[PDB]
Design an enzyme around this catalytic site. Structure first.
Site, PDB file in Angstrom:
ATOM      1  CG  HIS C  10      -0.312   0.052   2.514  1.00  0.00           C
ATOM      2  ND1 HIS C  10       0.284   1.191   3.009  1.00  0.00           N
ATOM      3  CD2 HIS C  10      -0.164  -0.913   3.459  1.00  0.00           C
ATOM      4  CE1 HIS C  10       0.761   0.930   4.218  1.00  0.00           C
ATOM      5  NE2 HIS C  10       0.511  -0.339   4.511  1.00  0.00           N
ATOM      6  NE  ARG C  61      -1.009   0.901   7.269  1.00  0.00           N
ATOM      7  CZ  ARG C  61      -1.341   0.603   8.517  1.00  0.00           C
ATOM      8  NH1 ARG C  61      -2.489   0.987   9.048  1.00  0.00           N
ATOM      9  NH2 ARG C  61      -0.510  -0.111   9.250  1.00  0.00           N
ATOM     10  CD  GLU C  88       2.885  -4.164   9.584  1.00  0.00           C
ATOM     11  OE1 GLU C  88       3.277  -3.535   8.588  1.00  0.00           O
ATOM     12  OE2 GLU C  88       3.330  -5.287   9.949  1.00  0.00           O
ATOM     13  CG  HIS C 182      -0.253  -4.011   5.984  1.00  0.00           C
ATOM     14  ND1 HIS C 182      -0.595  -2.693   6.180  1.00  0.00           N
ATOM     15  CD2 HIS C 182      -1.413  -4.713   5.980  1.00  0.00           C
ATOM     16  CE1 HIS C 182      -1.913  -2.610   6.299  1.00  0.00           C
ATOM     17  NE2 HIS C 182      -2.429  -3.821   6.201  1.00  0.00           N
TER      18      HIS C 182
END
Lengths: 226, 218, 218, 224
Positions: C10, C61, C88, C182
Site C-alpha cells: 500500500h 490504507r 500489519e 503491508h
C-alpha cells in the site's frame, strides 16, 4: 488410449424410484423417500459414474429427500463424500398443488379430456393450488426462511423452469466457467428442461454428460448407460 | 426492527448531465455525482446506520457510489457484492440517444407507452453494445439482455433480490443497496404490494414489512 | 503460467509521514499515498493484468489502495475480500510511537532484536492507551484471537492459515490473484513461497510449483 | 414452561465405532468407515438431538468418512438432510504418522515407558512420520488440492489443535456471531480441544455450548 478432456463438465442424473412412484401417486414437492429399489438405483448410478472415471468438484441437489439421498449414495460409491454439496429449492420438482398425492383415477376425474391431453403432451398447464384441509408440502419447516411470496402452489413445467433457470444461471454456470466438473442429482422434468435449454431445442438409469469449452460453448452431449 | 433494508440511488452520471440515456452504458459519476454520494453517506451516518453488507450493480456509477458511502460511514471493510442482475435496463437501440432521438426513433404510440412494458429494439448493427464489455465475459451468453422493458429488467432482478437480499434480512441483518432508480422503484413496488432521499424498510422476523420511511437532509 | 499471484504494498499513510509506527492503528493514505496507488494501478495495467479476485487487510490504507488500483484497472466490479488476518503486526505498547520513543521504551538488546530479528514481541497496550483493536470493525471476531503486541513471527503464524485456506486454493483453480498488503506481510509471503531465511509477481504450474518470481517497477 | 434461548448455539457430537476401533488399531487420518454398530451409534445420536428439539442452520464434519457418514445419519434422523453441510481437513483427527494402523502391543514396543506416559496423560508428544512403504492416508486424492507443505505427517494433539483452531475461528465463530445454531460431528480429540479452548481449562453424549452476541460462553451442557 486417452481422450482430451473438456474445459468443464456437467453431469445430470435422475433420482431413482420413490415411495409415491411405487404407490402410483404424484408427489411433486411431497417429500417421498427412496424405496429399496430406488436405493439400488442410486448405487447403480454411482457405479456407472465410477466406471467412466468422473471426479466432481461440487454436487447439487434439490431440497427433496429423494434427490438428496441419491446424491449421498452416489458420492459414497464414487469415494467423494467429502466434496462440496449444495441443496436448493429452486431445483425442486414442480409443485403439483391440488394434484399432490393423486392417482390416475383422481387425475382423470379432476381434469377434462382436453386438459389431460395437454398435461401429458405440453408443459404449459398449471394445476390449481392445494385445497383447504389438504396437506401442502411447502408448509414444511425446511422452507421457513423463503420469501413467502415466492413459494409456489401449483406449478406448470414452464413455471417450474422459470424459477429453476436463474439458479442454473447464477450457481451452475459460474462454476462451469471456472473449469469445474459439476454433478446435479435432479428430477426428470428439471433434467429435461436443462437439456432443452443447453441444446437450444433417455433410459431410467441413464446419465446426461454435457461438455463445454472456456467460452461456455456446448461441445458435446453424451448419454451414458450401463 | 429485526432486520432493515436501505436503498439509495446513485447520483449524477456524465450521461445524465449530457441528457443522454445510458442503460448498461457504463457512464461514471460527475463531480456532482461524487458530491451526491458524500451527501448520501453523511445522511445515513447522521441516522446511525451500520450495515452488515452492501450490494451494487456491475455499473461503475453504482459501484463508485457504494465505495464513497462506505467511506463516509467508516465501513470500508464490510462485505461488498456487485452483480449484473441489479443493473439498470439495457436500452438496446436507444442506448446513448438523447430525448430528441428517442422521439425520432419511436412513434408517438411507442413513446406514449414509454408504463413499464415497452421493450426497446436491440442494438443496431454497428452500434457499440455495452454488454460486449469484458466484465460480462463469464455470464451465460443466453441470459444477456439486448433491449429491456422495465418489466423485463424486474423479471431478471427479482430472483437476485429473493435469493441474496431476502435471506440476509431473514437472518436479521442490516443491508444496504446502492441502486438505479428503476430498480429501486421495482423493489419498493414489490415490497409494498403496489436526489438525496433514501428508502428504509423495516421488517420483523417473519418478513412482515413493519414500516417504510423516506429519509432526507430535509 | 497456470496461475498468478501479484502482491503490492500500500502507499504512504499519515503515520509514515509523521514517522510513527502504526501497526493496527488505522491511519489513512496521504495525498502522496493516493498517487502511489494510482501509479501502482498504471503499472499493473501496462503489464496487462486481469484479476479474478483481490484481497486486502482490514486497515483503511490497504482497502483504499485496493479500490484505487481496481479503478485504474477497470476492474471495480471484481470480487474483493478484506480480512483481519492480513493486517500489519499489532505493535501493542509501541503503537503510535516514533523512533525516539521506542529507543526510550526498549532496552539496548531489545531494540537490537526488534530491528535485526522477527521474534521480539512488543508489550501489550498500556492502561489508558488507545488500543486499535477496540474498533467496532473487530466486534465480530473471537475476542480470544485478537492480538495485543505481536512479533513479525506471531503475525505470520496468524496470517499463514488465511494464505493457505483462501489464496492457495484459488491459485490451484488457475486464478489470477491480487493482494494489496503491508510490507511485513508481503515479505513473509515471499519467504514462505520461495523457502528463504513495486510489485511481486509469482507464477505457478498446475501442481503449485513456483516457476518464477518477478519484480516489476516503473 | 419455556426457557429463554441463547443468541447462538454450538453442538458437538463424536462419531461412533469405526472398523479400526473395533479392531483395536489406531486410525488417525486412515479413512476407516463406520461399523454396523457405529451406524446404530449415529442413529441414536440423531434421536438424542431430536428429543432435545435441535434445529441446525449448518453442520460441519471432517474430511474422514466416519465423521461425514455420522453427519448424514444424524441429519436424516433430524429431518435436516437439506441444510448446509461443510467438510474440511482442518477438523480431521490427528495424523498419527508411523503409529497409523498399530495395535496396543506395537505402540508399547515403539514407545518407551516415559513416552507412553506422556502419550496418555499430555498433549505434546508428536509421533514420527509414515515410513517408506507404509501407506500414508494423506496420499488420498481427496487431499490433492492442499498446499503440500501444510499436510501433516505425524501430529501431536497440540499440533492438531494448532491447525484446527484457525478453522474454528474463521468458519465456526463467524456463524455463531450471526446467531446460528451449528452442529459439528467431530473426533474425540478435536471435541476435547474445542471444549478446553471454549471453557479456558460418556459414550454417546453430546456437548452443547450457548453464547451471547459478544461470544461470551453462557453455558456448557452435557446431554445423553
Amino acid at each position: 488410449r486417452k481422450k482430451i478432456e473438456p474445459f468443464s463438465t456437467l453431469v445430470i442424473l435422475r433420482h431413482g424410484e420413490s415411495l409415491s412412484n411405487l404407490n402410483r401417486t404424484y408427489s411433486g414437492w411431497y417429500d417421498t423417500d427412496l424405496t429399496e429399489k430406488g436405493i439400488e438405483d442410486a448405487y447403480a448410478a454411482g457405479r456407472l459414474l465410477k466406471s467412466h472415471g468422473f471426479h466432481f468438484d461440487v454436487c447439487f441437489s434439490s431440497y427433496l429427500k429423494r434427490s438428496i439421498r441419491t446424491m449421498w449414495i452416489v458420492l459414497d460409491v464414487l469415494d467423494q463424500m467429502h466434496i462440496q454439496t449444495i441443496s436448493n429449492w429452486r431445483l425442486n420438482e414442480c409443485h403439483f398443488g391440488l394434484l399432490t398425492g393423486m392417482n390416475k383415477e383422481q387425475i382423470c376425474t379432476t381434469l377434462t379430456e382436453e386438459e389431460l391431453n395437454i398435461w401429458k403432451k405440453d408443459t404449459c398447464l398449471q394445476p390449481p393450488p392445494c385445497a383447504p384441509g389438504q396437506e401442502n408440502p411447502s408448509d414444511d419447516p425446511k422452507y421457513k426462511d423463503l420469501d413467502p411470496r415466492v413459494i409456489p402452489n401449483g406449478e406448470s413445467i414452464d413455471m417450474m423452469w422459470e424459477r429453476a433457470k436463474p439458479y442454473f444461471i447464477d450457481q451452475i454456470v459460474p462454476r462451469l466457467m471456472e473449469g469445474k466438473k459439476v454433478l446435479i442429482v435432479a428430477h426428470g422434468n428439471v433434467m429435461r428442461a436443462m437439456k432443452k435449454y443447453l441444446q437450444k431445442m433417455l433410459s431410467n438409469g441413464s446419465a446426461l454428460v454435457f461438455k463445454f469449452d472456456n467460452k461456455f460453448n456446448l461441445l458435446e452431449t453424451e448419454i451414458i448407460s450401463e
